[PDB]
Amino acid sequence: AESWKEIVNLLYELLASLIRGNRANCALFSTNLDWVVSKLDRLEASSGILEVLYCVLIESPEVLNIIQENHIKSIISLLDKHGRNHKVLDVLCSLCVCNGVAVRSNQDLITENLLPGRELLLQTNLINYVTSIRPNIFVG
Amino acid sequence: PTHRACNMFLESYKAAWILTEDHSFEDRMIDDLSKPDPLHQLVLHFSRTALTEKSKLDEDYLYM
Amino acid sequence: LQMKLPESVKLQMCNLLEYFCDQELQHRVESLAAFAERYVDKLQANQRSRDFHQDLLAHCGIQLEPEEETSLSSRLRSLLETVRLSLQELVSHMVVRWAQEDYVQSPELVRAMFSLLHRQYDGLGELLRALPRAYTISPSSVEDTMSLLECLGQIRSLLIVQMGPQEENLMIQSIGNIMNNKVFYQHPNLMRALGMHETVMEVMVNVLGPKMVTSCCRFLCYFCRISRQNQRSMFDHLSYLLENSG
Amino acid sequence: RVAHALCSHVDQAQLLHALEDAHLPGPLRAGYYDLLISIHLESACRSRRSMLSEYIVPLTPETRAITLFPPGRKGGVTTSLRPPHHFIPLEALRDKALRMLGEAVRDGGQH
């Protein structure tokens, strides 16, 4: 079983390496990919899945054209479940633009879903200076 | 305007007559040549880079 | 700013420098048009005093090379000297020299610098390209022209895309609508991107790359009908299109 | 959707403040400038540049006067016709920008 955990860990890396310079490798990735989003959202092996997903995302225009809302939501959910690794953002960037030209519809859906919550991200405001004094030395 | 069309024709004619000569490209090249990276050697290197590993090459004007 | 700096800074600087040269050419183009105007009227007057364009061209040719040259040939020679003719150019040369004395790293910057150097001293050639692309508008209309231009611009935007989401189709319908509107006519003289028509054709091919497609085909067909010469350009485009259809 | 993102937040005011603002993370400063340009937004600029590539000649006597002189040479009265931007702090943003460049040469003092 321990041996199995180690093997499981490597295999993902091999797949990513295999898909690294082949535009076509990007295509096998698409069907593999529906299956992949599902597998990808899983515990015990996050870096490998993330890398494979990233490769697929930057892999080809076709993969970008293909898309599942179920899939987008799942990815966003995975990102929320796991703290940002500078990785979730990378994945989002990957989803965006082919590019080429990014797909307005996909972009809009993803953007709304992430943005709508306002629970990302951080957020900023301007704030005047919260400020105070009292009089007296002491009272009480 | 009809006058506008006439003007356009006149312009085409001037351009037609206008090509002359005197280039000086040779002079500029000479200056660049006189002018440890190559003064132009850099240009040659740039050409090698554009390109390598590309599926196809597109008539970039600067190169040609 | 002659100050030594990180090179990328150099690329940004090169971009600004590039931006100016373009403004400068535009001025030259505008200048040619004015000279052409006045002289054209005087020439028309001479003709009145006593195909036609070809004859006029021949006369001009003899003058700057001769029939009815008149005193004005001296005037044309004078204008010609002016065209032949800057400080910006010298500055650009100095800039190129500084870039050279250092060794560029990163290709985009080098390419930019090189193209700039070329325009900067090759000159004239830029002028010829400019002459080829110049359209002259006569004192009338224009609002229609502006509208057509805006419509064309939207088309370009749709072309950049995106992957084509339909809304682009509605926009295309709107452009078709301007064409339906009759703004564009006197439009053979009016054409730009691969003719507005070939720009559109490229768009359609990428699109080929439904109802919108049919509309585009109709628009192309309509454009054809308009120019025999336009028809021939359309025809070369057409051979390409036929190949694509294959 | 970019306009909506801008409604975010960020904010026009936030962006103005950031531009006026000095210091902070390099990744952050660059990112902010980029975001503002994209959503401020530049897009219009890209469209304009594309239109701007060609040259359009107009026929108005004011336009007629133009012309250039050899004795003399200068940088920049244009008769060229470009569609008006559909469309911030426009001239105001511009003033702020002109100001920053000066601040910039000063910073771009030596060492």
Distance between the amino and carboxyl termini of chain A: 67 Å
Oligomer: part of a larger assembly
Number of strands of chain A: 0
* Helix content range of chain A: 55-70%
Radius of gyration of chain A: 21 Å
Protein name (chain B): Ryanodine receptor 1
Organism (chain B): Oryctolagus cuniculus (Rabbit)
Family (chain B): Belongs to the ryanodine receptor (TC 1.A.3.1) family. RYR1 subfamily.
Subcellular location (chain B): Sarcoplasmic reticulum membrane
Question: What does this molecule look like?
Answer:
This is part of a larger assembly, with 4 copies of chain A. Chain A has 140 residues and is an all-alpha fold. Chain A contains 7 helices and no strands. Chain A is elongated and about 75 Å long. Chain C binds chain D through residues 1, 3, 20, 22-24, 26-31, 33-35, 37-38, 81-82, 85-88, 130, 133-140, 142, 145-146, 149-150, 152-153, 156-157, 192, and chain D through 47, 50-52, 54-60, 63-70, 73, 75-76, 78-83, 105, 108, 110.
